[PDB]
Specification:
The structure is a homodimer. A five-stranded parallel beta sheet of chain A has the order 2-1-6-5-7. Chain A has a two-stranded antiparallel ribbon with strand order 3-4. Chain A has a two-stranded antiparallel ribbon with strand order 8-9. Chain A is an alpha/beta fold and 203 residues long. Chain A is 30% helix and 22% strand. The first copy, chain A, has helices spanning 52-62, 81-87, 105-111, 131-142, 168-171, 175-193; strands at 2-8, 20-26, 38-39, 49-50, 68-78, 92-96, 116-121, 160-161, 164-165. Chain A has a domain at 2-143: 3-Layer(aba) Sandwich (Alpha/beta knot). In chain A, helix 2 (81-87) links the parallel strand 5 and strand 6. Bound molecules: 5-[1-(pyridin-2-ylmethyl)indol-6-yl]-1~{H}-pyrazol-3-amine (2 copies). One 5-[1-(pyridin-2-ylmethyl)indol-6-yl]-1~{H}-pyrazol-3-amine binds at residues 84-86, 110-114, 133-135, 137-142, 145 of chain B. Chain A: Homodimer. Chain A: Belongs to the RNA methyltransferase TrmD family. Chain A: This is tRNA (guanine-N(1)-)-methyltransferase.
Chain lengths: 203, 212
């Protein structure tokens, strides 16, 4: 059993969500001011940084000492399939979705004193916020909840379509020849598309 | 000006993007995002999108017949076809920059064990096709991958929306026993830049040693 809490300033983005309960929290519910979640960065620079004070009160109410705090960030550790397996057995996940240029560092540092904190990246691209990354994390984790190489090409009926035939080995019904072909196709694809997985230089 | 078409069996998954778009960008004709149900192009009364894999195996493969019809109607010869897949080329920031100047993007969102390979192969004979992965993890479909692709591409299109970045700080100067690093309040902007560069290198060594 697992509980996932997602904290964000845009709770509407998280709308695409027995054994698991998923709750979305608006961060602006923890502001006592009439107007603000963001302020200018110390030391200068572009954009805005999310204030630590608002995040502190939100995570104090939601998180326990057993909580694993997930902070999506482009500067984080790589979130992989290995990470997804490690997180699928967790009791409580809190995903802190940032916006603007990110969250004040002291939020992750403060939470690390009472709980386990993971700053993670889902890929080498920049998103506008952690909301999209949260949806990626949730999907990757939840499909592994109890209850190595690139995948080869997949085919289904008809056997001939638009003048393109399904590879005749798959129709033959020879399990040993099918497995040998599929392994060949997977290894040829991994060389071409992701040579790093087999231990070669990226293009 | 950019048109994005998304084809999926779950069109409700792509509600975040359409909601997150500002009205000013749509009214100026900079962006038009349209979501299409794949079951519009089904042939049978049961509205079948999937069928059993050739050569055995677990799970199901999405039908080439239904997908072929959908792409014939939506795609032109100037279309760049984006097909999210765990076995694809890596989608990076460089990939996002290249696609930000494109006129027509069609994202084909698969489910089950993926789409019949002949769909992309047929499309490759008359248009540019990109099979892409957003990371080294497996999702249930291409819908979450599409939201990632759309957000990354569109934020680089103006008005629509290397080492690792160091720690960022804001008000207050003191919070829960932690002070903002005094260098950031010194007024020595040469020293700040050098401090930020060192923090960037330290974070890169610790978190992403592959980039060095
Ligand atoms: N793998 C990832 C993670 C992210 C991500 C996660 C959370 C936030 C909150 C804000 N931004 C924007 C932003 C812009 C400039 C520098 C830092 N951050 C985020 C981006 N994108 N791609
Ligand atoms: N970087 C990526 C891409 C995907 C992705 C994209 C599209 C589909 C359509 C179906 N599945 C599930 C599935 C499971 C087992 C083998 C093949 N596919 C998808 C997964 N996940 N992570």
């Amino acid at each position: 059993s697992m509980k996932i809490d997602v904290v964000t300033i845009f709770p509407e983005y998280l709308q695409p969500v027995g054994l698991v309960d998923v709750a979305v929290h608006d961060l602006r519910r923890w502001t006592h001011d009439v107007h603000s979640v963001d302020d200018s960065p110390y030391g200068g620079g572009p954009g805005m940084v999310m204030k630590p004070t608002v995040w502190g009160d939100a995570l104090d109410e939601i998180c326990t000492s057993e909580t694993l705090l997930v902070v999506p960030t482009p500067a984080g550790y790589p979130f992989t399939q290995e990470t997804a397996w490690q997180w699928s057995t967790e009791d409580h996940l809190v995903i802190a979705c940032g916006r603007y240029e990110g969250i004040d560092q002291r939020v992750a540092d403060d939470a690390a004193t009472r709980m386990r904190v993971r700053e993670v990246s889902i890929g080498d691209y920049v998103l506008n916020g952690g909301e999209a990354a949260a949806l990626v994390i949730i999907e990757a984790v939840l499909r592994l909840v109890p209850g190595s190489l690139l995948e080869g090409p997949s085919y289904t009926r008809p056997p001939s379509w638009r003048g393109m035939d399904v590879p005749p080995v798959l129709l033959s019904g020879d399990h040993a020849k099918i497995a040998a072909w599929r392994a060949e196709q997977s290894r040829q694809r991994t060389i071409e598309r992701r040579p790093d997985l087999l231990g070669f230089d990226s293009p």
